């Protein structure tokens, strides 16, 4: 009844203040998104544990600065989800979203 | 012409740059055994090497290695495609894709 997405984010400039995640359901339903904040950190960068109150197989994600001051990769990207859980790694300026730790 | 210059930018998310260097070998138009090249500089993205080879090359191989082959950062051979004897690339720890503009 929920989808949990752990998002790892690394910026080579070390300047994470204000960066947050705009995530929206896409399948099996499309709905307007919400902003999610980073909740922790590890050796790769910031960590967000995102909980969405539906079972989802795909979401959209944009890494954004404050309220749309900038987009780190300014196009919609997607995360494929199995059994209500995914974990991804995202790097500043790199379009590809990784499903294993670099 | 008669030399090839490759500027190689390297970023590690863990900051553990100590010992890392570049193994580069000519591949086209003629293949030869490689050589190690050290980083000489640094910028906001991380380490920088300027690699000069005394031939006009359209393709080189590259491996990012720790000292004398103690480890590789991405273990498979990778290649850089070069036009008119000059190229510049950006390499990220653990990321296979070599980038041709700054992330
Ligand atoms: O089912 C809901 C909708 O879902 C999908 O919409 C996505 C977009 O595709 C994403 O790009 C994003 O939209 C962001 C947008 O990227 C961002 O620039 C900002 O856009 C605002 C803008 O700041 C504002 O000034 C105003 O002019 O409107 C803009 C909207 O374009 O904020 C957007 C979020 O509000 O996320 C949405 C989902 O939230 C889907 O593709 C749509 O078909 C669908 O309606
Ligand atoms: O002359 C053209 C040759 O070019 C190509 O050879 C390449 C390889 O494909 C690359 O992988 C690399 O080789 C490295 C190798 O990756 C690395 O592991 C290391 O291997 C050592 C090892 O540490 C050591 O313990 C012992 O086993 O010796 C090994 C080498 O036999 O070092 C290699 C380089 O010395 O670079 C070369 C070019 O230098 C092409 O594939 C060949 O067919 C071609 O002959």
Curated annotation (Swiss-Prot), chain B:
Family: Belongs to the glycosyl hydrolase 13 family.
Protein name, per record: Pullulanase
Organism, scientific name: Thermotoga maritima (strain ATCC 43589 / DSM 3109 / JCM 10099 / NBRC 100826 / MSB8)
Shown residues within the full chain: 18 to 120 of 843
